[PDB]
C-alpha cells in the first residue's frame, strides 16, 4: 500500500499553506483535463502549482495502480484538509411541550404525540416558594414492532403509472405475517380490498410495491393500512398531482384612484381573459386578485401575514444577497409605521406588534453575520472570496437598520475601513476583489471597463452615505470627495442610462449644489420616457436614445431599477411634480406579494415607494369595492375601510372576464392580478442562451449532461454573462447524485458556486456563462422508482438579476 509517491506527495504538503489546493487537485474530474480545469483557479500562482503538481501525479497514478490501492490513498490524503467540520447525521425534530403551568396540587392536560418513532423524555421543574424540585423523568417511547412507511414522492405529474414503493420493518426476532392494502380514491385508477399474506423475516424488512395512475389534479388522499398480528394501523398519505409542462406566471396591476389626485382620473378597469396559444388541455387557467389599501399595503401584507412569504420566492437562495432580502421588507414597513407615526392601525397592542417587527429586523441582522470574513469583510458565497460589491450592499442595508435596531458599533467601523483602505484607486474609483459579476453592462470592453467602474463606485457611495452617520471617521470622508469627484469628472457623457441614474443618485446624498450635478439631473431628465399628454406614466430604459430609438412595453429589470434611481434622486431633491407619473408606473409593475422583478430593483424600488409614501397623509380610504364577472354574477364584496384594509387576496374560479368597480368614495388603492397558466412549448419566447441537455450512459450508471452558452445582446461585449442560475427540473422518479454536485462547487477549481436540490429541482448558481464554448454540468442519476408514461421535464437557465434573460428546453 501507499505505493511510493502517495507518501511523499502528501508529506510535502503536510504543513503547507496551499495544502488544500493540492487536495482538490487529486479529485476525480473525468471530463476535464489538468490544465483545462486549472485555468479557472483564482487564488494566485502558488495555489495553481500546488494544484497541477498534485493533479498530474494522480492521473499517472491511476493508470497502472489498483482500485484497492488508490482508495487507501484517498484516506492518506485526508490530512491535507482543514479539520473535521461540525456536522450531525440525524435530524431531531422541534421539541414539543415547552410551556409553564400553574398546578394547584393536581392538573391534567392532554395532547397528541407527534408522528415520529422516537423515545421522548418529559422532565418537569417546579419553582415554588419552597424551592426548586426537578421531578423524576418519564419516557414516552412510541415504538411499533411491525410498521410500514411509504416513500410517497413529493410531486407526481398527471398521467404517469407511479410505482409507490414502501417498506415494512419488523424489529421482532421472530419472523411474522402481514398484509398491506390501499384506500382507492375516485381520482386514482389502481390496477373491498383483498388481503394477500406476505411474510417478513425476523429482524429484517420486506418491500411493498403498489401502482397508481392518477387522473385528477390536486391534493388527494391515500390510506395505507398495514394489518399485522398486532392490530391494524392506518397510515394517511397525501399524494399531490401536478400538471405537465412549464408554469408561466403573468401579472397585471391597476391603481384605484376615484378622485384623480396626482394625474388623470381612474374609476374603471376590465381584465381580459386571454387564453394563450400553446396551452395544456383540461387544466384551468387560475387567477388570484389582490386589493390592497395603501401604497405600502401590498408590502404590509407580506410582513403582517403569518404565512411566511418572501418578496422573491421565485429566485433561489444561497447568495448573501438572498439573505439580505429577508430583512429589507421588514425594514421598509418599520420605516413607515415609525417615521409616519401610523401605530393606530392594529387591533392588538401596537407596542406589542412593534416588538414582532423589531424581532425580524434583529433576526435578519444575524443572517449575514456568517458571510462576514475575519477582517470584517463580506464574501458572497459561503467561504468565497471577499467582494467590494457585497460590502457596499451590506453597509447600505445595515446602515439603514441602525435608526431602528441598535447595531454593533465596531462592526461597521472595520467594514467601512476595508473599502476605503484596500480597494479604492488614486482617482476615487473602486475595484473588485473576486470575479463576481452582479450586472452585465453593454458596449465593447474598453468602453465597458470605464462603465463598469462607474457602477462599482456609485454602488459604493450609497454604502458609504447610508453608513456615514454610524462611524464618521476622517478617512472615509477624505475618500468620499474623490469618490464624488470621479462621479463628476467621468460620468458625462454616459454610454448607458442605467449608469447615468446611479451616478446621479450616489451624488444625491452629499453636495447637491454643483454646476456639474444639475448638469447630470437635467441630462437625466433628457432621456426619460412619457406616456400620454399630460404624462400619466414615466419610466426609463437601459439603452441610450440615439443608438436605440424604441419605446416598448413589458419592461425588464434594468427598466425598473433605472426608474427607481431617477425616482430617489428626485425624492432627495424633493421634486413632487416630476415624479407623480413615476409612482403610478412603479406601483403597477409591482407583482403580488411585494416582490418586483429581481433583488436589485426591489431594494431600490420599495424605498421609492416609502420616500414617496411619506408624502400621502391619512386619505379616508373607505369604499364598497365590488368585482364581478361580465356574463356571470358577482362573487362577493365587503366594506373595505381603514379598519380592515389588509384583506385576503381572493381566488377567481370561473372562466369569465373580470371588472373591478369603484364608483364614488375616497382613497388611493391598488388592484393586482396574477394568472398561472401551464404550457406545453416555449419556442415563441426569446432564448438568450444556447441550451442542450442529453442523458448519456457513462461506463466507469446513467448520467445527465447539460450545457449552456450566453447569447450576447447586440452592442455588447462578448465576454460572457453575469450571475446566472441553472435550474434543471428532474423527471419523476429520478434522483440526483449529490456527491457529483458537491465535487463541482467545493474545489478551488470550482465550476459553479453553490448548488441546492430543492423539491426535486437542481438549482445551480454560477458567476459567468461564456459565449465562446459551452459550460456543462455532469452529475449521475438513478431511477429511484419505476414510472411509466414519463412526462418530460424542463431545463431553464436565467440571469439572477435579469430573470427574463432566459431559455427553456424540454427533456426526458
Amino acid at each position: 500500500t501507499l505505493q511510493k509517491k502517495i507518501e511523499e506527495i502528501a508529506a510535502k504538503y503536510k504543513h503547507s499553506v496551499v495544502k488544500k489546493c493540492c487536495y482538490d487537485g487529486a479529485c476525480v474530474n473525468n471530463d476535464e483535463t489538468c490544465e483545462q480545469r486549472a485555468a479557472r483557479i483564482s487564488l494566485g500562482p502558488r495555489c495553481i502549482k500546488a494544484f497541477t503538481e498534485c493533479c498530474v501525479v494522480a492521473s499517472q497514478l491511476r493508470a497502472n495502480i489498483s482500485h484497492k490501492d488508490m482508495q487507501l490513498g484517498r484516506l492518506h490524503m485526508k490530512t491535507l484538509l482543514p479539520v473535521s467540520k461540525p456536522e450531525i447525521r440525524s435530524y431531531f425534530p422541534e421539541s414539543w411541550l415547552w410551556e409553564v403551568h400553574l398546578v394547584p396540587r393536581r392538573k391534567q392536560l392532554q395532547f397528541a404525540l407527534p408522528d415520529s418513532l422516537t423515545t421522548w423524555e418529559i422532565q418537569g421543574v417546579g419553582i415554588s416558594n419552597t424551592g426548586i424540585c426537578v421531578a423524576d423523568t418519564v419516557k414516552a417511547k412510541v415504538f411499533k414492532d411491525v410498521f410500514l412507511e411509504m416513500n410517497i414522492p413529493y410531486s407526481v405529474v398527471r398521467g404517469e403509472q407511479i410505482q409507490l414503493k414502501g417498506t415494512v420493518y419488523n424489529y421482532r426476532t421472530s419472523g411474522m405475517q402481514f398484509c398491506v392494502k390501499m384506500s382507492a380514491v375516485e381520482g386514482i385508477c389502481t390496477s373491498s380490498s383483498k388481503c394477500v399474506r406476505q411474510k417478513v423475516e425476523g429482524s429484517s424488512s420486506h418491500l411493498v410495491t403498489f401502482t397508481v395512475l392518477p387522473l385528477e389534479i390536486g391534493l388527494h388522499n391515500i390510506n395505507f393500512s398495514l394489518e399485522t398480528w398486532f392490530g391494524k394501523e392506518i397510515l394517511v398519505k397525501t399524494l399531490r398531482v401536478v400538471p405537465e409542462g412549464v408554469k408561466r406566471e403573468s401579472y397585471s396591476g391597476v391603481t384605484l384612484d376615484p378622485r384623480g389626485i396626482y394625474g388623470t382620473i381612474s374609476r374603471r378597469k376590465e381584465f381580459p381573459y386571454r387564453i394563450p396559444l400553446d396551452l395544456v388541455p383540461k387544466t384551468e387557467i387560475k387567477r388570484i386578485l389582490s386589493v390592497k389599501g395603501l401604497l405600502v399595503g401590498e408590502i404590509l401584507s407580506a410582513v403582517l401575514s403569518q404565512e411566511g412569504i418572501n418578496i422573491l420566492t421565485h429566485l433561489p437562495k444561497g447568495s448573501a444577497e438572498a439573505e439580505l432580502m429577508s430583512v429589507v421588507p421588514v425594514f421598509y414597513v418599520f420605516h413607515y409605521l415609525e417615521t409616519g407615526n401610523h401605530w393606530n392601525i392594529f387591533h392588538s397592542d401596537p407596542l406589542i406588534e412593534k416588538q414582532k417587527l423589531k424581532k425580524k429586523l434583529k433576526e435578519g441582522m444575524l443572517s449575514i453575520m456568517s458571510y462576514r470574513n475575519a477582517d470584517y469583510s463580506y464574501s458572497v458565497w459561503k467561504g468565497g472570496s471577499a467582494s467590494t460589491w457585497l460590502t457596499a450592499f451590506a453597509l447600505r442595508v445595515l446602515g439603514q437598520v441602525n435608526k431602528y435596531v441598535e447595531q454593533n458599533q465596531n462592526s461597521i467601523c472595520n467594514s467601512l475601513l476595508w473599502l476605503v483602505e484596500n480597494y479604492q484607486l488614486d482617482n476615487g474609483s473602486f475595484k473588485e476583489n473576486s470575479q463576481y459579476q452582479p450586472i452585465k453592462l453593454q458596449g465593447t470592453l474598453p468602453v465597458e471597463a470605464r462603465e463598469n467602474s462607474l457602477y462599482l463606485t456609485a454602488f459604493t457611495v450609497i454604502g458609504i452615505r447610508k453608513a456615514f452617520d454610524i462611524c464618521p471617521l476622517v478617512k472615509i470622508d477624505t475618500a468620499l470627495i474623490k469618490a464624488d469627484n470621479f462621479l463628476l469628472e467621468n460620468t458625462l457623457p454616459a454610454q448607458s442610462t442605467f449608469t447615468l441614474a446611479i451616478s446621479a443618485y450616489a451624488l444625491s446624498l452629499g453636495d447637491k449644489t454643483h454646476p456639474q450635478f444639475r448638469s447630470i439631473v437635467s441630462a437625466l431628465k433628457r432621456e426619460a420616457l412619457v406616456k400620454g399628454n399630460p404624462p400619466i406614466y414615466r419610466f426609463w430604459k437601459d439603452n441610450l436614445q440615439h443608438k436605440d430609438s424604441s419605446v416598448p412595453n413589458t419592461g425588464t429589470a434594468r427598466m425598473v431599477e433605472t426608474t427607481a434611481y431617477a425616482l430617489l434622486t428626485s425624492l432627495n431633491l424633493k421634486d413632487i411634480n416630476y415624479v407623480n407619473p413615476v409612482i403610478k408606473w412603479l406601483s403597477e409593475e409591482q407583482r403580488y406579494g411585494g416582490g418586483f422583478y429581481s433583488t436589485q430593483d426591489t431594494i431600490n424600488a420599495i424605498e421609492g415607494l416609502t420616500e414617496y409614501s411619506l408624502l400621502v397623509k391619512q386619505l379616508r380610504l373607505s369604499m364598497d369595492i365590488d368585482v364581478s364577472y361580465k356574463h356571470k354574477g358577482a362573487l362577493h364584496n365587503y366594506k373595505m375601510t381603514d379598519k380592515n384594509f389588509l384583506g385576503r387576496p381572493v381566488e377567481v374560479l370561473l372562466n369569465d372576464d373580470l371588472i373591478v368597480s369603484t364608483g364614488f368614495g375616497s382613497g388611493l388603492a391598488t388592484v393586482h392580478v396574477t394568472t398561472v397558466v401551464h404550457k406545453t412549448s416555449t419556442s415563441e419566447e426569446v432564448c438568450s442562451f444556447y441550451l442542450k441537455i442529453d442523458t448519456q450512459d457513462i461506463e466507469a450508471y446513467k448520467r445527465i449532461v447539460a450545457c449552456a452558452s450566453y447569447k450576447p445582446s447586440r452592442e455588447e461585449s462578448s465576454s460572457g454573462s453575469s450571475h446566472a442560475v441553472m435550474d434543471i427540473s428532474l423527471p419523476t422518479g429520478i434522483s440526483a447524485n449529490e456527491e457529483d454536485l458537491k465535487a463541482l462547487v467545493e474545489g478551488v477549481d470550482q465550476l459553479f458556486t453553490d448548488y441546492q436540490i430543492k423539491d426535486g429541482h437542481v438549482i445551480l448558481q454560477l458567476n459567468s456563462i461564456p459565449s465562446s464554448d459551452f459550460l456543462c454540468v455532469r452529475f449521475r442519476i438513478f431511477e429511484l422508482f419505476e414510472v411509466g408514461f414519463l412526462s418530460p421535464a424542463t431545463f431553464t437557465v436565467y440571469e439572477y438579476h435579469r430573470p427574463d434573460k432566459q431559455c427553456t428546453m424540454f427533456y426526458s
Partner: protein
C-alpha cells in the same frame, strides 16, 4: 416454544450451587397475547345426555369494525347444531374493542373426553383464530 394459551406465563428459576446454597430468582413474566381470538370458558365436567350451553367469547382488540364468521366444527360424539355435511356458521359484526358472547347449545352423547373445536375468521382481513378444547363428560 410458547404453548397455545393466551395468558401470562410466569417462569421461576431456583438454583443450587454447593457453596452458595439455594437462590430463588424473582418471577419473570411472559405475556402471550393476540388481537382477535376466541375465549372458550368451559365447565369442569358436564353430564352425559344432558343438554348444556357452552358460551364462547370473541374478543376483538382491533380499532376497526370487523366482520366475523364463527363455525362450530362437527363432532361425532356430540349432538350439536352442526350436521356432518354442513357446519353451524353464523356471521355478525363486532364493534371496535369489544366482545361478543357466542353461545353453543351442545348435548353430549358418549362419555370420556371429547373435542369442542370452534373456528372463526375475519372477512377480508388477516386475523383468524381457532380453538380446540377438550370437554369432560361423565355419567351418573
Amino acid at each position: 416454544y410458547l404453548r397455545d394459551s393466551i395468558t401470562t406465563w410466569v417462569v421461576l428459576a431456583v438454583s443450587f450451587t454447593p457453596t452458595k446454597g439455594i437462590c430463588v430468582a424473582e418471577p419473570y413474566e411472559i405475556r402471550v397475547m393476540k388481537v382477535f381470538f376466541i375465549d372458550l370458558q368451559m365447565p369442569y365436567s358436564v353430564v352425559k345426555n344432558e343438554q348444556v350451553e357452552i358460551r364462547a367469547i370473541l374478543h376483538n382488540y382491533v380499532n376497526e369494525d370487523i366482520y366475523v364468521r364463527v363455525e362450530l366444527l362437527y363432532n361425532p360424539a356430540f349432538c350439536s347444531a352442526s350436521t356432518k355435511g354442513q357446519r353451524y356458521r353464523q356471521q355478525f359484526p363486532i364493534k371496535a374493542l369489544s366482545s361478543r358472547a357466542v353461545p353453543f347449545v351442545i348435548v353430549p352423547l358418549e362419555q370420556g373426553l371429547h373435542d369442542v373445536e370452534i373456528k372463526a375468521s375475519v372477512q377480508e382481513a388477516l386475523w383468524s383464530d381457532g380453538v380446540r378444547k377438550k370437554l369432560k363428560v361423565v355419567p351418573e
